[PDB]
From Swiss-Prot, chain A:
<dbReference type="InterPro" id="IPR050257">
    <property type="entry name" value="eL8/uL1-like"/>
</dbReference>
<dbReference type="InterPro" id="IPR004037">
    <property type="entry name" value="Ribosomal_eL8-like_CS"/>
</dbReference>
<dbReference type="InterPro" id="IPR004038">
    <property type="entry name" value="Ribosomal_eL8/eL30/eS12/Gad45"/>
</dbReference>
<dbReference type="InterPro" id="IPR001921">
    <property type="entry name" value="Ribosomal_eL8_euk"/>
</dbReference>
<dbReference type="GO" id="GO:0002181">
    <property type="term" value="P:cytoplasmic translation"/>
</dbReference>
<dbReference type="GO" id="GO:0005829">
    <property type="term" value="C:cytosol"/>
</dbReference>
<comment type="function">
    <text>Component of the ribosome, a large ribonucleoprotein complex responsible for the synthesis of proteins in the cell. The small ribosomal subunit (SSU) binds messenger RNAs (mRNAs) and translates the encoded message by selecting cognate aminoacyl-transfer RNA (tRNA) molecules. The large subunit (LSU) contains the ribosomal catalytic site termed the peptidyl transferase center (PTC), which catalyzes the formation of peptide bonds, thereby polymerizing the amino acids delivered by tRNAs into a polypeptide chain.</text>
</comment>
Curated annotation (Swiss-Prot), chain B:
<dbReference type="InterPro" id="IPR014722">
    <property type="entry name" value="Rib_uL2_dom2"/>
</dbReference>
<feature type="modified residue" description="Phosphoserine">
    <location>
        <position position="248"/>
    </location>
</feature>
<dbReference type="Pfam" id="PF00181">
    <property type="entry name" value="Ribosomal_L2"/>
</dbReference>
<feature type="modified residue" description="Phosphoserine">
    <location>
        <position position="94"/>
    </location>
</feature>
<dbReference type="GO" id="GO:0019843">
    <property type="term" value="F:rRNA binding"/>
</dbReference>
<protein>
    <recommendedName>
        <fullName>Large ribosomal subunit protein uL2A</fullName>
    </recommendedName>
</protein>
<dbReference type="GO" id="GO:0005829">
    <property type="term" value="C:cytosol"/>
</dbReference>
Swiss-Prot record, chain C:
<comment type="function">
    <text>Component of the ribosome, a large ribonucleoprotein complex responsible for the synthesis of proteins in the cell. The small ribosomal subunit (SSU) binds messenger RNAs (mRNAs) and translates the encoded message by selecting cognate aminoacyl-transfer RNA (tRNA) molecules. The large subunit (LSU) contains the ribosomal catalytic site termed the peptidyl transferase center (PTC), which catalyzes the formation of peptide bonds, thereby polymerizing the amino acids delivered by tRNAs into a polypeptide chain.</text>
</comment>
<comment type="similarity">
    <text>Belongs to the eukaryotic ribosomal protein eL34 family.</text>
</comment>
<protein>
    <recommendedName>
        <fullName>Large ribosomal subunit protein eL34A</fullName>
    </recommendedName>
</protein>
<comment type="subunit">
    <text>Component of the large ribosomal subunit (LSU). Mature yeast ribosomes consist of a small (40S) and a large (60S) subunit. The 40S small subunit contains 1 molecule of ribosomal RNA (18S rRNA) and 33 different proteins (encoded by 57 genes). The large 60S subunit contains 3 rRNA molecules (25S, 5.8S and 5S rRNA) and 46 different proteins (encoded by 81 genes).</text>
</comment>
Amino acid sequence: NPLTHSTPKNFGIGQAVQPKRNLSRYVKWPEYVRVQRQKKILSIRLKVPPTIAQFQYTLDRNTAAETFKLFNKYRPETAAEKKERLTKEAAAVAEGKSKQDASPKPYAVKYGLNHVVALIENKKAKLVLIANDVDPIELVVFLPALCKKMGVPYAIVKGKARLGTLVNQKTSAVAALTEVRAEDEAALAKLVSTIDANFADKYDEVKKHWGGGILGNKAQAKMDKRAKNSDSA
Amino acid sequence: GRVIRNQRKGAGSIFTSHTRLRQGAAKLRTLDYAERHGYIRGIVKQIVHDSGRGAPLAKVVFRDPYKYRLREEIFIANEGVHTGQFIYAGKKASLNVGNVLPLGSVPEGTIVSNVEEKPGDRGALARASGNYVIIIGHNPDENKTRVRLPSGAKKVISSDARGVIGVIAGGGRVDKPLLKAGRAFHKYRLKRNSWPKTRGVAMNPVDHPHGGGNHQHIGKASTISRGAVSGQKAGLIAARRTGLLRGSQKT
Amino acid sequence: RPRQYATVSKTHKTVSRAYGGSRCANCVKERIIRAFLIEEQKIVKKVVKEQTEAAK
RNA sequence: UUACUUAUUCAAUGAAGCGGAGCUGGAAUUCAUUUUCCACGUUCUAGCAUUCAAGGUCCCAUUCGGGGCUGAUCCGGGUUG
RNA sequence: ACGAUCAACUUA
RNA sequence: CUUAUCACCCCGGAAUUGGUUUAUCCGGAGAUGGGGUCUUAUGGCUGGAAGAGGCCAGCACCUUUGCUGGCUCCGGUGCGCUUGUGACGGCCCGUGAAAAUCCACAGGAAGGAAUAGUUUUCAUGCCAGGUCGUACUGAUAACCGCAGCAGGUCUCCAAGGU
RNA sequence: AUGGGGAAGCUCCGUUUCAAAGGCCUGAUUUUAUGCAGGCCACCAUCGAAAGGGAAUCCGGUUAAGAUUCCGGAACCUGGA
């Protein structure tokens, strides 16, 4: 204690070498990082047509969790299970000459953009989930309008990766329930009712309502300061 | 009928500047944090002759505020700046000869030099020997400064632009007659290949619009339009008036 | 020459004083005096600032 | 002509101190106390300033040493004009 | 109030 | 090993100014004076190394031919020539490259103690140092000019007399 | 050259610029390993001089011709141990 002393250096303008602070704000990021951030900034700064702001309107966490629990219950067959069903069917049709009906009727989630659009056109799907993160937006823009026209319940969910892991894929961008077992039909009905109240009953108003137009942090601060200066008496 | 001297100068193969003996670009230090939020003290350590430039240059040394090391800068020496002297660069520096206060910091009527055209370009105005810029006035709202340029010109520039206070050293140089084609030869042999100049009337018509004729005469008017094209712009370009002047600079 | 300096021992390339082979005795003495005197000036300026702040 | 910035254009920087709010004080002296402004540790000297920084505080399975917070305010990732 | 050895190269 | 200009240090503290260069430049920011320190230009003494090389004399004798002896030592001079170096002065609106490379200094990281550790910047000791050029002319005959052409073609050393 | 930008294109500009541009030390000491409990930066290709810069050799002898290269003697530098 008597040997040590109080050094403290002064970090003034021209006093001493500045300490190693966090310069994460001023990192010269790679070009692709810059394109990422600036593309997001441009998207939120331009006045997006209502197809955006009907997207980016992902359903809330609880309803998303319930939907994905039900869909995980209705998860499709995997490779090993498909192989087992295949050999069982082959044995059955080889010993009893069954008309390929030994295996039971499947109850899975029908995925794929073309397949789901055809199901909506044919009025076979009972519930649709559309990923909000589809990289080319051309593929999903028409989907809420088509679902509304065909009177089929739709919900805009968060995560094409989540949809892919739901359908045992990498990215699905769509999911659909077309048939429900009697064991969870009531849960499905309540969940689709809340999804309807969230999306279908508000389709028209949301299609009317535009989005975007949000300015940056410094721009908003300048706007507030200028307004205060203008109305200062 | 052939390309002329200025047209060749633009291509600039033998017309580039002789830059071997120059001591580096004479620029102010960068405006990062200390020059705009306070001041930084540097030592002008040496004063040298920059070849091809009529003004002396100053090797000055500052401390890097972020890493332990010394930063050397090449300033244009103002008159009275001596070796081993404390100069101060920043917004809050004191009004002394050699300091690098911004225009918004210097008061009305101050004499500055090597002033920035825009904040952060490290000096663009009044850099030749014996020249300086006067502060005519300030406009705090939309912060700006009206200044007078050695051409007797009025320029309104941002108040954050900096400039070293004083006058460039080496003044009065052009007061001495060169007295010799040899002195002119040495001067321009260190500056650039622009000397001696043959007269267009002395050249042939292929070589110049002024060439040709049984007598050495221009032939047509020597005042050339601003809209004239390359190879035609020889003589007086867009001359508003012409002839011996009688009066003042009207300023 | 520099390579001869490389092959020559340390004694001939320096003097026993601080800043031996880099700065002369007069410069070393002047900078020692400057260091001590400026530190003393800084200390007395600091105590003057402290006392005037306490007074005001 | 108006309150714009994201297209585009220009210039720098090792993209380091941008915008906003808070720690501290000096004011007209406050018709009730952030209501309006400012400062945010350096100018007699060709010295020095660098070991995730010394100190402070809490915790130490305690070897020839350390860990978090602080010193070095917080939020927004718009590098700045 | 005091003096020997010792180049010889320029002028008159 | 020893030797200088320049520069630097200690001691007293200088007008009656002194010292001093061919050239007038310094001295209370400390000169004259006394003493000392430093640079490897340069010189000197050694070792190399007289055993070498030169200058002589003598004796064997088709035998790719030899061997002995002596000397090689002291000086001097200079507006001498050339070259290098040093302290300086003149010139410039001209102030007369870069880089590789090699040292040194600030700082204190880490490491170190009675037969065990710290130094291979002190001395001595061991090994290796690859690849290409290397002959000759370089000019009234080896280059170019149709040629062994009175032409052209860069540079180093430079005795005596007038 | 490269990144990058022009040009229908042979190719042009550009040389640090709007690029995610990167190699050596006591080293953990034994199946691993410039993967590792570790450390710092910032020239930011390359080419360009047999007259610029530059590590180090001299004497004597020797050949039909080579010698500061061979031989004899006497040295020095670089790298390593």
